[PDB]
Design a binder for this molecule. Sequence first.
Ligand SMILES: CCCCCCCCCCCCO[C@@H]1O[C@H](CO)[C@@H](O[C@H]2O[C@H](CO)[C@@H](O)[C@H](O)[C@H]2O)[C@H](O)[C@H]1O
Ligand SMILES: CCCCCCCCCCCCO[C@@H]1O[C@H](CO)[C@@H](O[C@H]2O[C@H](CO)[C@@H](O)[C@H](O)[C@H]2O)[C@H](O)[C@H]1O
Ligand SMILES: CCCCCCCCCCCCO[C@@H]1O[C@H](CO)[C@@H](O[C@H]2O[C@H](CO)[C@@H](O)[C@H](O)[C@H]2O)[C@H](O)[C@H]1O
Ligand SMILES: CCCCCCCCCCCCO[C@@H]1O[C@H](CO)[C@@H](O[C@H]2O[C@H](CO)[C@@H](O)[C@H](O)[C@H]2O)[C@H](O)[C@H]1O
Lengths: 101, 55, 77, 85, 189, 101, 102, 378, 167, 87, 61
Amino acid sequence: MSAMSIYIIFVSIIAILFLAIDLIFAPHNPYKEQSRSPFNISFFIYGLVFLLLDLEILLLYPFAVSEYVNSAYGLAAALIFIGIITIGFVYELGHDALKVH
Amino acid sequence: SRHIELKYPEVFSHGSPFNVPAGFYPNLDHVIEHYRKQHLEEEERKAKKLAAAAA
Amino acid sequence: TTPRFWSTPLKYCRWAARERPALFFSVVIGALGPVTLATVPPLRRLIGDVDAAPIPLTYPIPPGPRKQLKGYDDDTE
Amino acid sequence: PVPFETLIPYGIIIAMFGVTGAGMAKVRHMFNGDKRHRWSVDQWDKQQMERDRRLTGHLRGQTDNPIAPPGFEFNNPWKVXXXXX
Amino acid sequence: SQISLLLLKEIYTNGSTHIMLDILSVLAVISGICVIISKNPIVSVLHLIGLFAYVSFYLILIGLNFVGLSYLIVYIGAVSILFLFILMLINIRTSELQSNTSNSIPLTILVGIIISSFLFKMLPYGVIISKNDLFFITSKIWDGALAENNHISSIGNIMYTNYNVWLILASFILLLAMVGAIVITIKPR
Amino acid sequence: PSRGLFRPRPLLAGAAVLMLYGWYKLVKGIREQNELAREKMWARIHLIPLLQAEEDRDHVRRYLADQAREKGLLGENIKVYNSDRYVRPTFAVTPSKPAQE
Amino acid sequence: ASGYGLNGGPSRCFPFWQELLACYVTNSSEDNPDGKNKCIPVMEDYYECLHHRKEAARVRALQAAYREAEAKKLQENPPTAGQIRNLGLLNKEEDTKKVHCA
Amino acid sequence: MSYSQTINSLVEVVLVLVPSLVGIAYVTVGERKTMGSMQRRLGPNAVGIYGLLQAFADALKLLLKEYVGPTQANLVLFFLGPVITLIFSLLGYAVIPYGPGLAVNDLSTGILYMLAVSSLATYGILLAGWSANSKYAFLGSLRSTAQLISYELVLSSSILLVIMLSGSLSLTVIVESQRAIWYILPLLPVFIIFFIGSVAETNRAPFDLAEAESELVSGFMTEHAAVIFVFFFLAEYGSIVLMCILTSILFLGGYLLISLLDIIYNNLLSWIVIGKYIIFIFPFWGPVFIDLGLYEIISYLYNAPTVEGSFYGLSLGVKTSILIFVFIWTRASFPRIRFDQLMSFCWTVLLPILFALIVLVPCILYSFNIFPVNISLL
Amino acid sequence: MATRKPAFNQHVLLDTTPLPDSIPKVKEIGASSAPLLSASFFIGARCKDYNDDYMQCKNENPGRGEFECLKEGRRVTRCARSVLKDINTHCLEQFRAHWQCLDNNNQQLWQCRPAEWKLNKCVYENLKLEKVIPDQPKNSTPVHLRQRQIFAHHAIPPWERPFIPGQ
Amino acid sequence: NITLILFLIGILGFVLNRKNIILMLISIEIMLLSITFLILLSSLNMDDIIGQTYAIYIIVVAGAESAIGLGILVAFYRLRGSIAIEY
Amino acid sequence: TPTQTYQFPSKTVKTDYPLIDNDPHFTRVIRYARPSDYAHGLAAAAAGPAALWLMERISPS
Ligand SMILES: CCCCCCCCCCCCO[C@@H]1O[C@H](CO)[C@@H](O[C@H]2O[C@H](CO)[C@@H](O)[C@H](O)[C@H]2O)[C@H](O)[C@H]1O
Ligand SMILES: CCCCCCCCCCCCO[C@@H]1O[C@H](CO)[C@@H](O[C@H]2O[C@H](CO)[C@@H](O)[C@H](O)[C@H]2O)[C@H](O)[C@H]1O
Ligand SMILES: CCCCCCCCCCCCO[C@@H]1O[C@H](CO)[C@@H](O[C@H]2O[C@H](CO)[C@@H](O)[C@H](O)[C@H]2O)[C@H](O)[C@H]1O
Ligand SMILES: CCCCCCCCCCCCO[C@@H]1O[C@H](CO)[C@@H](O[C@H]2O[C@H](CO)[C@@H](O)[C@H](O)[C@H]2O)[C@H](O)[C@H]1O
């Protein structure tokens, strides 16, 4: 079989064995024994800006593994793509959208 | 019109230039001659238009 | 307290370099990218550092008519 | 002074990384026919090794006979699949 | 004299099994219903995280490594995390999100039959290609293997030059999602 | 008790000279890699015609066999493409069972 | 039809598409309405390159005739896989002859 | 091939996983022993001859401890949630080369494989703090999740600068490119930004205040969800070691070790076939190395596959160990940053610098004709 | 058959049917991957015209070049067969030393410079054939003729000298 | 056939939903995944890298609508206090 | 004469005057520009700020 497959199974098996020791040996007991408040908008912004910048950085990864062919024409277009995304970053820096300062 | 004229005839120049196998790309010299005729006819038509009416 | 760029642009550049260093030098390093692209290559070709030709990424077909070779035929099997 | 007793765990980690690399290169050396393994392989390299199995039977086998053996013009493998396309 | 066509099992270049695709598709379907039936919106999003990974694995298993990894990095890494944030913070009463699904059960048979019976015919032969059975034959090439590129390198070769207008329009779509989302949510200054 | 090991002026100078030395060594190395790549490509180009020729006889062989296998079985050859181009096969006829092994 | 394939290019059906575009542009104009009819076969070749329906149909038939022909003829001694893994090897000439049945 | 692939696969998987698991268990002993030398005390020295069984007792003690998990409307989150956190922790190891192409998987998109495993890791923190029965503690898990997503962008934007110099996402190719120079020298700022991001991603001090305040508001009526699981600790230490190996792959030499053969070749000029091996140097003399006894054995022992593989692992092992030291030294050196302050550091200091360097580096690469080829070479 | 890389291939289909008698026959090359790469520059030094005719021919017949370019393929395999025969007859000792090196070096030329330099001096003296990489930069030493190789796993000894054709 | 099944699932998410406006966000994404997966599988069948590019841009636009949508849902929640439809 | 004066398929546009270039280089466009183009460009340029000033005097912001 492939090494990747046998590796995932082995990691899976080790996890089962460590779990089994807890179930087999560790002590067990049958006895296993409402408000509202606004949440900070900051939590939304952290995932929002991450999601957008993560996509933009992702779109740049193909350029890095194709630079010999993209060359000067590709560099130019990738710089125009960098500049547009940077201007959006300066906007979140300008409005302290992250509400960190 | 029942005929479509390509807005982008430069699609004939499309195609990856890498890892090209011999005999993959078709010969399009007859396409090139059709588009050459068309350029030459408009050049001449205009030349007749602004030289036979400017005298 | 803090300067105004349009009113005093050189005194702002000193204040931002001292008071907003991470931001100021991001804008500076960013500008050094368009500078290096407009200066180094002219200086490189001034001293004779030529660009390498592109490496082959397709079989290099020869231009022109075929050469009508003779030799290595079936009789030479 | 040097507290060597705190350095002992660090030597174990270095020795562990050493024995992984030591043993992995040994089993890939015996896997490849008592010869060093191939690394950044592409469609070309993989096809070049398939033709090594055509001439010798081993994906890493090598021979410099200018004349291919009889039957070599028939053992060219055409892979058959059921789903991918 | 003997059969000219000969069938043999490959030994060290034997690829993967078609079965894994029937397993992943069944898993993708099973988690798909569990998304639209679960009472808790949290559990639905978790079953959605499960679905996105089954499809990602199917793509990686059929050779689409960069897009499958991209799906894993974007959908599970970022899109669903934003879904957990909003869901784990909004006050959700689960009784107010439950509706009598049985009232809607007759329209589910109707809509499923009609939509499937139309869209299926529309697909191309190669999507529905899968008792004598066809097998897909493949052979090797040399001129087209000189400098083979990974798919990301091939996407990169054309993404920033020939089809660069798509990058420009997408950069402005992301730019709009940045400015617009901040303007509708944050209190200025 | 100020010490020069942590004074900014020696540190920036030391960090700067390290970056220039590494940028000199990166310039030379990638230039060598790109010339090693040129020799690798020319090496595969001089071999591509012999390798493609042996493949081409194999494609001619199987196609002429399949054309004959049909004429002996179905009574004629069913034309797939209206053009006379050679299209590399997508599907093939296979024996019902593999070799016993 | 884009002309760029998964491995660094080009695409497998791109030759048929250029053959189709060439046919339409060079035979069909506003003067002659039925010039495009010379394109009907060329379009089928391109729809067939992408989807392979007609080829699948030829193979399903030819494969059914082949299997119904080799399931009734007498078999002498089928070659084992190990024999057909030694075919064309430099030291197994005996097995190559058995595979070739010469 | 010579033997069965399935055996080959198993031998490689055990040779990588078992020595890596014993190493992750000595990083825990090493943290305590290092912090104690810097804090003028000793580390563990009692459970074991030199405290070398301390990890084993602590790991075994947790396993035999009763778990008080609520199990209320949850029998899949408690017993299948944390288990996959540990599967994700070990998944990144399979792309680690202990030599040229010596990995379980030699993957061309090896870098994008590691980014995918990092994005999956964020779930364990988010789900671990879901069982926290506190208003502020639950919020601390979201804040820790927000620190991971933010510093992942720093890590992914920084890796993009190595890929620009290397041309490939294969970890083997990335190391082989460093034969010209280690990436720490030409990308010095990028390295120090990557290391800080890696500490923040691992949620270690001085970047752990979010998850630290959680233990302060528990009260006298609640409990935590890490009372007996060794799973999360193994995931944590495994993540630290994996981050250090990746840092050494990208910026130090990876498995590349300075070669004496090159240094001795340049200096030596009096080659002698009689075995004397005279040297044309000022401290040189006439060596008496035995051709039949020493030189023959030494030459063969240099080119043996086990020896060369052993010194490539030892190189990568030394460099990971040095970086593990910097993690422990950093924890023993600084106070904790507040969550707001770390968020400003990521978003108003390190990301603007990275984006500026993202512009600059390809501009310099084009200017000096130094774009690498993206075909399979090296 | 299709040039798509396979993902779930478990079986191989062989065809024992030979070529028809009408096609003139050829003896296929029997050298493996590593011997071919050792002699790749020697084959392109002599067979370049025939290698170029074959590619130019197939180009002149789009979609029909596997057939319609057979005789040219037979000429390329005879010419390449003549170079492989010549290295065996004269350069056998140095030739094997070179490609057995490439066997354990990932088939990477920079890893085996000393063996190639000694093989280059044997071929040039016996067959007058020289290795030319086209369009190499003029401001620097040719990479194959450099005393130091940066990406080499093992250092090149100073006494091992690059072969320059005439010095 | 898997791509059509998942497209039904996203569609049936709208068929079976009277109260969840969150589940309509989820069902839109299941429909986008099915359409991208169809383009991706047909791309491998035609040796076309442009399908992979179109899939990538559908993933970017899909995330951008998720951001625009969950932001609008946050604006709505701030003033309403519930994301529940009074049915 | 290179023997291929028209080498690429190009779009013909119905215009009123002879085509010189479908894609001139930037330096040539500046070089062939008439002094009227300079007046027209500067006249439009100033029109933007001048509209904002006039709009300030009449309806104050
Ligand atoms: C994950 C892979 C699949 C699982 C593999 C391992 C399965 C193990 C199953 C058996 C576990 C036995 O573990 C054992 O369970 C019993 C019953 O709950 C516990 O018994 C406990 O609860 C019972 C409840 O009636 C009490 O009467 C008893 O006094 C108390 O000790 C033991 O304290 C515990 O040690
Ligand atoms: C390639 C990298 C390029 C990096 C470019 C850097 C961006 C430069 C432009 C943006 C910074 C200038 O924009 C400026 O942002 C700061 C920080 O929020 C704001 O700062 C001010 O407002 C915010 C919000 O009330 C307060 O929290 C802050 O304490 C106060 O000082 C300024 O009101 C704004 O004018
Ligand atoms: C697979 C093997 C490991 C499985 C899990 C085994 C248990 C792992 C957790 C223990 C590992 C050490 O973890 C770390 O140890 C040190 C003890 O020096 C503790 O540190 C503690 O003691 C030191 C004493 O100087 C104090 O200064 C510090 O304030 C205090 O927090 C840390 O709180 C703990 O996070
Ligand atoms: C660009 C990155 C490329 C390489 C990516 C490698 C990813 C490896 C991370 C997988 C492991 C999961 O991620 C890791 O999980 C553990 C527990 O869940 C976390 O550890 C957390 O829990 C443990 C125990 O509960 C605490 O002692 C610790 O203070 C806390 O940080 C780590 O903060 C996190 O780093």
